[PDB]
Amino acid sequence: DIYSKVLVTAIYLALFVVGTVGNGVTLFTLARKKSLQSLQSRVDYYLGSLALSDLLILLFALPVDLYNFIWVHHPWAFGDAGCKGYYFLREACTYATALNVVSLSVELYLAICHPFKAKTLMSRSRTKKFISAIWLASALLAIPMLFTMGLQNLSGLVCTPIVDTATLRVVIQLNTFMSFLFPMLVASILNTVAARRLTVMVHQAAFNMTIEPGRVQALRRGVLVLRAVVIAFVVCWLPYHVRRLMFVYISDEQWTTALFDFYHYFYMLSNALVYVSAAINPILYNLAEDLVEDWEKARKLLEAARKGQDDEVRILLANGADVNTADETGFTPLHLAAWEGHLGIVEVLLKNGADVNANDERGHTPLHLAAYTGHLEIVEVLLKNGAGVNATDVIGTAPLHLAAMWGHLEIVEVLLKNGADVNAQDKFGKTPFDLAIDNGNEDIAEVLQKAATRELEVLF
C-alpha cells in the first residue's frame, strides 16, 4: 500500500519539523535562563534531560526510521555503523525518557509525602549527579543493541537481529521491564499515593477558616500535570513495547507476506505515537514553567507585602499574581501588609480584589492585626472595603477587644461608628470595657460604658 506510507511520511514530517524546533527552543531557553530559585533550577534539569532525549529521537531515529523502515523498498543507506548506532541511540533514549518521567514522580512524591525531609535534603548539585547517572545507566543498558543488531543480506541489505531468537527475546524482555513496565508501575503508584496524601493535606489545611496555602495549591496542580504525563507515556509507548514483544515471539516460519503487511501497519502506528510523545514534550515544559512561575509570583507577593516594596507588589499583580495567597499558617498578603502597616500596599491589594475577611490558623482577619497595630487609616480603609467588625478568632477575641486592650481611642471610636458590638466578650468572658480596665485605659472605658448604657436606654 503506497498511500499508507505517504500518509505516515506527512505525520512524521509534521512531528519532525515542530518537535525538533519545539525541543530545540526548550534547551536554548533553559541554557540561557540563569534561574536563581532552587525549585526552578532543580525542575529545569529534568525538563532539559527530557527535551534532549526527545530531540535525539526526532533528529536521528525518525529520519533513519522513515527512509528504511517506513519506505521498505529502499536498501539500507546508513551501513553497519548506522544500523548498530540507530538501535543503540533509540534504546538509550527510551530508557532516559522513562527514567526522567519516573524521576519527576519520586520528586513530587518526596515534596508531597516528605516535605520537611525533601526541603532540606534536596540540592541543585544532588540533581545534576543523579541525572548524569540516568544518562550513563541508559547508555550502559543500550550497549547490548550494538551486539544484537547488524546488517544481513537477503539477495538486499536489512538492519535485522544477527543473534539467535533466544538471545533476542531476553535483551528486549529485559529492556521492556526496565525501560517501561517497572518505571510506569512506580510512576502510577507514587502518583496515586501522593494524590491521596495531597487530598488529606487539602482537607487538613481548610477547615472552619484557613483559606488554602499556595504551596499546597502548587502541589495540587503538580499531581494533575504528572497524572497526564503517566497516562500520556503509557498510551504512546505501550504499543511500541507490545509490538517489539510480538516481533521476538512471532519469529521465523510464520513470517508470511500477509503477516508482515499487518505488522507494518502496527509498526507505522506504534512508532508514530512514540514521535507524538516526543512532540508533545514541550507542552509539559510550558505547563511546568507556568505552574513554577505562578508559585514564585505568589511567594514574591507575600515577601513584597511584608517587606513593603510597593513597586514590586504592583509589578506582580499586573502579571496575574494570586492576590489571595495564604502562607504555611494561612496568612494572605493583606494580613502581612496590614500587620506591617503599609496603607498603600493594603489599598492596592483591596483594589485588585483581595479577600478583606480572610482568616489565618488563629482565625485572625486583617482588621484584628490593624487593631493590634493601631493603624487607624488601614482600619478605616478595611472597614470601607466591607471588613467584618464583629469577626472573632478561636479564643473569641474581636477587633474592639484588641483596640481597647492596647489603647487606640481613635480606632475604638471608628469601630463603634461601624456597628461594633461593645457587649460581645471572649471565651474568658472579658468584654472590651473589662480588658480596658484590666490594662487601665480609663479614657477608653468611659467611651465604652456610655455606649452600653445608651443601648439599655434604647431597649426601653
Ligand X SMILES: CC(C)C[C@H](NC(=O)c1cn(S(=O)(=O)c2cccc3cccnc23)c2ccccc12)C(=O)O
Give the footprint of ligand X on this chain (CB under 6 A): 69, 72, 87, 158-160, 172, 244, 247, 255, 260, 264, 267
Q: Which is nearer to ligand X, 207 or 249 (CB)?
A: 249
The answer for residues whose C-beta is within 8 angstroms of residue 310's C-beta and 6 or more apart is 342, 344, 345, 348
Q: How far apart are CA 9 and CA 92, in angstroms?
A: 24
Instruction: Decide: 400 and 424 in contact? Cβ < 8 Å.
Output: yes
Q: Which is nearer to ligand X, 159 or 304 (CB)?
A: 159
Nearest approach in angstroms of CB 247 to ligand X is 4
Q: Which is nearer to ligand X, 67 or 406 (CB)?
A: 67
Q: How far apart are CA 41 and CA 39, in angstroms?
A: 6
Q: Which is nearer to ligand X, 94 or 441 (CB)?
A: 94
**Cell numbers 538509550 correspond to what residue?**
92
Q: How far apart are CA 23 and CA 14, in angstroms?
A: 14
| CA 211 from centroid of its chain's CA atoms | 20
Nearest approach in angstroms of CB 53 to ligand X is 18
CB crowding 81-100: b at 16 or more within 10 Å, else e: ebbbbbbbbbbbbbbbbbbb
Q: Which is nearer to ligand X, 175 or 441 (CB)?
A: 175
Q: Which is nearer to ligand X, 168 or 394 (CB)?
A: 168
Q: Which is nearer to ligand X, 15 or 420 (CB)?
A: 15
Q: How far apart are CA 300 and CA 282, in angstroms?
A: 26
Q: Which is nearer to ligand X, 113 or 168 (CB)?
A: 168
Per DSSP, the three-state class of 157 is strand
Q: How far apart are CA 94 and CA 237, in angstroms?
A: 9
The answer for residues whose C-beta is within 8 angstroms of residue 410's C-beta and 6 or more apart is 376
Q: How far apart are CA 322 and CA 315, in angstroms?
A: 12
Nearest approach in angstroms of CB 267 to ligand X is 5
Nearest approach in angstroms of CB 354 to ligand X is 58
Q: How far apart are CA 115 and CA 126, in angstroms?
A: 17
Instruction: Decide: 263 and 242 in contact? Cβ < 8 Å.
Output: no
Nearest approach in angstroms of CB 31 to ligand X is 32
Nearest approach in angstroms of CB 246 to ligand X is 9
Nearest approach in angstroms of CB 205 to ligand X is 48
Nearest approach in angstroms of CB 175 to ligand X is 9
